[PDB]
């Protein structure tokens, strides 16, 4: 299937509070494997998935110096942004950037992207042509032209189509044995009394991995889209996930309701009846 | 590995 390599970058200025908190988090197929936090004791890049330990001392050193460099870079952008928006000097702000590559099973780059956001708002972003940018506002124009003035697009493209893809391939090696992990949800339905002679049927999906899952309720063949509530899938805390979905049915006629759980770890879509 | 960013 398709795999991706992505770094999530955050910088938040803390006026009066001192120098900005800087953080880099890397993800392979959506699983965290490296992180760097300026607000730690000895801020250095460290492995976040056990298989990343097979990388020698050099790797950690190299990425730490780089992160220390990326850190100052963003330290300056924070400031640059205050001018672009003529904003307060003592206000805290945030920059977030997502940067990475999605490549297919045939090794081709399906997607390369570097997206910026300032205070939770899209700022700039690399078009899928990996040659031009799309500014969000008039401040983003200043950077667009400036980045075009230093041919940044060309070099970002080189990383995206080469380095990123090349290092993705390398982590997949060290991580196949763990990245493929699959854990089926154990489902079940509970019954909760309601007034007006009505009832709540809650279908639960627990202990599953990865998070991608789907629950639906069925009333005589058709799946109820109406008054059906379902919570955000959530972390159990041990690497597994949980999620439930429920519907309100009249009492004495629930047995005409079936829950369906669709998870990739199941030989087949579970089917639950109260 | 990570990219070397270029300020705005």
């Amino acid at each position, epitope marked *: 299937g398709p795999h991706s390599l992505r770094y999530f970058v955050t910088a938040v200025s803390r006026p009066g509070l001192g120098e900005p908190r800087y953080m880099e988090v890397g993800y392979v197929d959506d699983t965290e494997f490296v992180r760097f936090d300026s607000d730690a004791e000895n801020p250095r890049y460290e492995p976040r998935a056990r298989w990343m330990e097979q990388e020698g001392p*050099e*790797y950690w*050193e*190299r990425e730490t*110096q*780089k992160a220390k*460099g990326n850190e*100052q*870079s963003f*330290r*300056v952008s924070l*400031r*640059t942004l205050l001018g672009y928006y003529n904003q307060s000097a003592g206000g805290s702000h945030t920059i977030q950037v997502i940067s990475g590559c999605e490549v297919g099973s045939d090794g081709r780059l399906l997607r390369g992207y570097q997206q910026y956001a300032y205070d939770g708002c899209d700022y700039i972003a690399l078009n899928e042509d990996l040659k031009t940018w799309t500014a969000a506002d008039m401040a983003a124009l200043i950077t667009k032209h*400036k980045w075009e*003035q*230093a*041919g*940044e697009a*060309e*070099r970002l493209r*080189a*990383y995206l*189509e*080469g*380095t990123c893809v*090349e290092w993705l391939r390398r982590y997949l090696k060290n991580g196949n044995a763990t990245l493929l992990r699959t854990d089926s949800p154990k489902a079940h339905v509970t019954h909760h009394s309601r007034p007006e002679d009505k009832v709540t049927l809650r279908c639960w999906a627990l202990g599953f991995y990865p998070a991608d899952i789907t629950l639906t309720w069925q009333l005589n063949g058709e799946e109820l889209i109406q008054d059906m509530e379902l919570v955000e899938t959530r972390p159990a805390g041990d690497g597994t996930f949980q999620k439930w979905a429920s519907v309100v049915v009249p009492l004495g006629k629930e047995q005409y309701y079936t829950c369906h759980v669709y998870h990739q770890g199941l030989p087949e879509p579970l089917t639950l009846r109260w | *590995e990570q990219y*070397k*960013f*270029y*300020s705005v």
Partner: T-cell receptor
Amino acid sequence: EAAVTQSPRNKVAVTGGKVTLSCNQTNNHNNMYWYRQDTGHGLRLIHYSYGAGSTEKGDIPDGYKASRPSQENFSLILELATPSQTSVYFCASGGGGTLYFGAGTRLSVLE
Amino acid sequence: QSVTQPDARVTVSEGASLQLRCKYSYSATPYLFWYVQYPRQGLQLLLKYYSGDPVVQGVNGFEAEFSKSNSSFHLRKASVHWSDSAVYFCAVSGFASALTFGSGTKVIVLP
């Protein structure tokens, strides 16, 4: 184009003297560098900057200082010149990858 | 991120071919660059390598080939003439956005 202008071109200063080499840039590049060139040492980094207000010691900062007043310029200050600093200096502006150099500045520190 | 040029001087005859040796030491793949320095001025880029195809073609018949194996980035020109006489620099970047320069190779091409 990618212009970078250093001033002065030449300088005859004496030990203990005060020397200011300045770099003006119209490249609108965020990063700037100050190097010195000597035989047997190729070019070596003294101080660079990630933007107006940024300054960070290079491989051989000792004896020099820098100030990044604005995007356009980056200065290398020599509050107390020593004959060891006699050399040719070059500032470069850079956009993350390749650097653009000014035409240099001969500096002679005499006793 | 380190780089070095083992041959301080290279003297070839006009119409001959040319190869400038460049070695880099580094745990990952670095950015690589080649610059030329004429008589009394700063440096000018001939070519760079960021990633991808190991053979990059630059200005005036110049071209290099990155070899991860050999950890090299040698410069070439099939046929040089007098005007190619100059000082050539190999450079590199990894950790930082600044370039680390090799000591340099002076090329003398005999007319």
